[PDB]
Design a binder for these strands. Structure first.
Lengths: 211, 215
DNA sequence: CTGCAACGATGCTACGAACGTG
DNA sequence: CACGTTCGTAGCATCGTTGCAG
């Protein structure tokens, strides 16, 4: 199966392989997507609510005016050149939606060495698939469980759209003697490596001194 | 024109981009196109709703969509969208199309022809070509130019009134120079307007050149 | 059995959109 | 607010493969 990808809201056109470009042709589009109760077979004329979702073109190609999470699925076209010539096209469909730029909330202006502080919560909105969130300090990324470094993360799918919202709250115990003017950022690393990662603006709180 | 050029094969779907438009509805944009089907200027909307919904329908993402092209679809296509706000963007498209005829055929081809005089060598025929395109003769693989040394071509173009397509015929006759190649090779080559594609050649003919009985 | 042709697949380049900077 | 740079996306071209005919 040939792997495929496109942006939600975008049109989609699947080429039927080995099939007459002009009608009438003998061919079958059978697919299973989030819009299907089972394998669904759409005909040359097609019919039903499916004409508003995915339709067969006079040239034998299947088409979707707007693709959505609901459409991730399997698409197979078994077609008849003339008779009995037969070739079968096979596609595997992943989709995606680029979320709004990441934001740190509840970020710290000041913080104190030797113990934990709330650095902030990096928050992404409107992503599919969900993807990952990471943090970095002055150019380099950070890992939990190492030298008092932890994370409280979560993911939530907006009911209407089906997209995702990821929260990541950063917390660290600053070494005493370190960088008093440190810069932190968060980055959204998408599930499908379609685009490069997106990074929040930095935060440069001031490390202060206990007694 | 500010119009960019687009060229498509007949029968295939085309999709035109609306520059700087909302990717999801609701969107404000309206297409304008004067072509074969449009009486003058047809304006199309994201809602569509006319008889054009089975022909030209604006997609949810703003682009213009044609299920399969046809000759009548040749013309200019423009869009006006508003990037909110109030940013506003344009598109100018010239769209032409084409069809490719079957491999040209030869007919009425001389069994053998004789020198020192004109001869009916035959006729090339190409059907289903668009735009019209042309038929060029080649002797041995080298061009044959009319008006020059007994070389003549009786030519026509017949447009199928229904398919709006072209049936082509080119009849070549030649006066061979006495004492020429006794087994010369003719071919015929159809060519279209742009490098929209390559050239199609007819299976050659290798007639026998017989000399005139002495007087 | 061999050659030629057509179709499909991949790679490349150019055009447009976005993002950041001054 | 504008200009300029970069990423992303889309189209054209190239090459290889498979099919078909001689």
């Amino acid at each position: 199966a040939q792997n495929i990808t496109a942006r939600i809201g975008e049109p989609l056109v699947l080429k039927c392989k080995g099939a007459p470009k002009k009608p009438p042709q003998r061919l079958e589009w059978k697919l299973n997507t989030g819009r299907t109760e089972a394998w669904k077979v759409l005909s040359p004329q097609g019919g039903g609510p499916w004409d508003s979702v995915a339709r067969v073109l006079p040239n034998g190609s299947l088409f979707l005016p707007a693709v959505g999470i609901q459409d991730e699925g399997i698409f197979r076209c078994q077609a008849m050149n003339r008779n009995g010539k037969e070739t079968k096209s096979n596609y595997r469909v992943r989709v995606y939606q680029i979320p709004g730029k990441p934001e740190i909330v509840d970020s710290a202006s000041e913080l104190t060495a030797g113990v934990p502080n709330k650095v902030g919560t990096c928050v992404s909105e409107g992503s599919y698939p969900a993807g990952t969130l990471s943090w970095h300090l002055d150019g380099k990324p950070l890992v939990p469980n190492e030298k008092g470094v932890s994370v409280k993360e979560q993911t939530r799918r907006h009911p209407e759209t089906g997209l995702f919202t990821l929260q990541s709250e950063l917390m660290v115990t600053p070494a005493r003697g370190g960088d008093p003017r440190p810069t932190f950022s968060c980055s959204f690393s998408p599930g499908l490596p379609r685009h490069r990662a997106l990074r929040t603006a930095p935060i440069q709180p001031r490390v202060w001194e206990p007694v």
